[PDB]
């Protein structure tokens, strides 16, 4: 048998729900995380999406960076599936967590590192382009740390909100050397500039640690895929990590 | 005679007030821009700061990126000094505004270009690290355009506000290749990452237009000058532009 698993990645903005019966093929959906969402509301949203699959679920695993949502997921699991979910957390084992406080690292990044070591080997740099844009370094199966910067949407929104005159710009790479209107100026600074920022952090990493392979993932990674030199593109890295952590 | 001029730079978070008698040396104060401030409230704030000098003011020049503040400045000038202010604007003259809508470029950036062309030459790249971080290009006396990204504080605050878990971090450069705690991750991504962003944008400008001199300016520019290659560091660039535009 190939038991069906529900894997959940709870983000600040969006939550990913995915089912697998093997841990290699994932069907996935995405919902807004919302505020004050309830377990019945969650069930109601998932019902026409999962269809008949809903009744086959045998385990629920979750990585969450939104502690407020966690009792909702717990309640959903118990009411609808009569099980408690398994929660992604940094713990001792095959990944060494070489940072000041491993329990402080977001469950999403933990999950990425778990999936990495499990599928891609012992040495790597993970770029997760999501709500935040995250860089994470794995050396010899030890998590060594990383960098955080605002994600693309976070940046354009910040300029729109933090300013009287700037518009909210659609995230799209610039193909010019300087922008000729406001929208172009922001595409160039936020999109192309964040790509330069990443290329720069990776560069300094590689000077100290070698020539590690780079995996790209995240909700916002598809738009700039080509622009960053990478060995692996894997949109399912986080959900793979939940799967491996919880269900091995 | 050496008439005293008040120069004003109205920004989204702060407004700079400076006095000069020569346009070569400036005394400056900074205040929050606030919301719903009145001309009497402005006078009240400036009164103990400007002191005796307030009586000597013969002209007021203003660059503003906050249109709702402008009527307040107009009324302040007329009530307390019986003059209308002079407003910095892109217009034909010593600078050619070679972009789609010159009237849409921020008055702060207009003033930076005016000061640069008047003070430093016909060819250059201006980096202004403030609310936003701006890049502007001038080639043979022609403003060619630029880039806009969130400023340092805007970035750290966007992470704090847009996230359940991330702290609000103090801006300070990273002296390390990867961060080992949340605060370090953010410093590396926002501060060092923004430096990389700027270097990559400038690099690409340089490839096309040659080795242009770079000026650094702005209220968040101190901490990072030792990280960017620049030929001119001038914290008074915008106020100088205001002076040159309005008072010659």
UniProtKB/Swiss-Prot annotation, chains A, B:
Record's cofactor remark: A monovalent cation. Ammonium or potassium.
Gene responsible for this protein: coaX
Names of required cofactors: NH4(+); K(+)
SUPFAM superfamilies tied to this protein: Actin-like ATPase domain
Catalytic reaction annotation: (R)-pantothenate + ATP = (R)-4'-phosphopantothenate + ADP + H(+)
InterPro entries: ATPase_NBD (IPR043129), Type_III_PanK (IPR004619)
Organism of derivation: Thermotoga maritima (strain ATCC 43589 / DSM 3109 / JCM 10099 / NBRC 100826 / MSB8)
PANTHER family listed in its UniProt record: TYPE III PANTOTHENATE KINASE
Sequence positions that bind substrate: 106-109, 182
EC number(s) reported in the record: 2.7.1.33
Record Pfam families: Pan_kinase
A Gene Ontology term for the protein's cellular component: cytoplasm
Pathway connected to this protein: Cofactor biosynthesis; coenzyme A biosynthesis; CoA from (R)-pantothenate: step 1/5
Keywords tagged on the record: ATP-binding, Coenzyme A biosynthesis, Cytoplasm, Kinase, Metal-binding, Nucleotide-binding, Potassium, Transferase
Residues binding ATP, per UniProt: 9-16, 131
Family indicated by similarity: Belongs to the type III pantothenate kinase family.
GO biological process: coenzyme A biosynthetic process
Subcellular location(s) per record: Cytoplasm
Name this polypeptide is given: Type III pantothenate kinase
Molecular-function annotations in GO: ATP binding; metal ion binding; pantothenate kinase activity
Lineage: Bacteria, Thermotogati, Thermotogota, Thermotogae, Thermotogales
């Amino acid at each position: 048998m190939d038991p069906m698993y529900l894997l959940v990645d709870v983000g600040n903005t969006h939550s990913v729900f995915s089912i697998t019966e093997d841990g290699k093929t994932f069907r996935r959906w995405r919902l807004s995380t919302g505020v004050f969402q309830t377990e019945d509301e969650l069930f109601s949203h998932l019902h026409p999406l999962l269809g008949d699959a809903m009744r086959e679920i045998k385990g629920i695993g979750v990585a969450s960076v939104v502690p407020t949502q966690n009792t909702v997921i717990e309640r959903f699991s118990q009411k609808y599936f009569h099980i408690s979910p398994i929660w992604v957390k940094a713990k001792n084992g095959c990944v060494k967590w070489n940072v000041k406080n491993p329990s402080e690292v977001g469950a999403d990044r933990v999950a990425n590192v778990v999936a990495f070591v499990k599928e891609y080997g012992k040495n790597g740099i993970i770029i997760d382009m999501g709500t935040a844009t995250t860089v994470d370094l794995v050396v010899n199966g030890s998590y060594e740390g990383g960098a955080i910067l605002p994600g693309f949407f976070m940046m354009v929104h910040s300029l729109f909100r933090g300013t009287a005159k700037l518009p909210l710009v659609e995230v799209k790479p610039a193909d010019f050397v300087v922008g000729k209107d406001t929208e172009e100026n922001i595409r160039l600074g936020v999109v192309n500039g964040s790509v330069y920022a990443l290329e720069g952090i990776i560069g300094r990493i590689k000077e100290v640690y070698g020539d590690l392979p780079v995996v790209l993932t995240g909700g916002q990674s598809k738009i700039v895929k080509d622009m960053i030199k990478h060995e692996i593109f894997d949109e399912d890295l986080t959900i793979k990590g939940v799967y491996h952590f919880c269900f091995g």
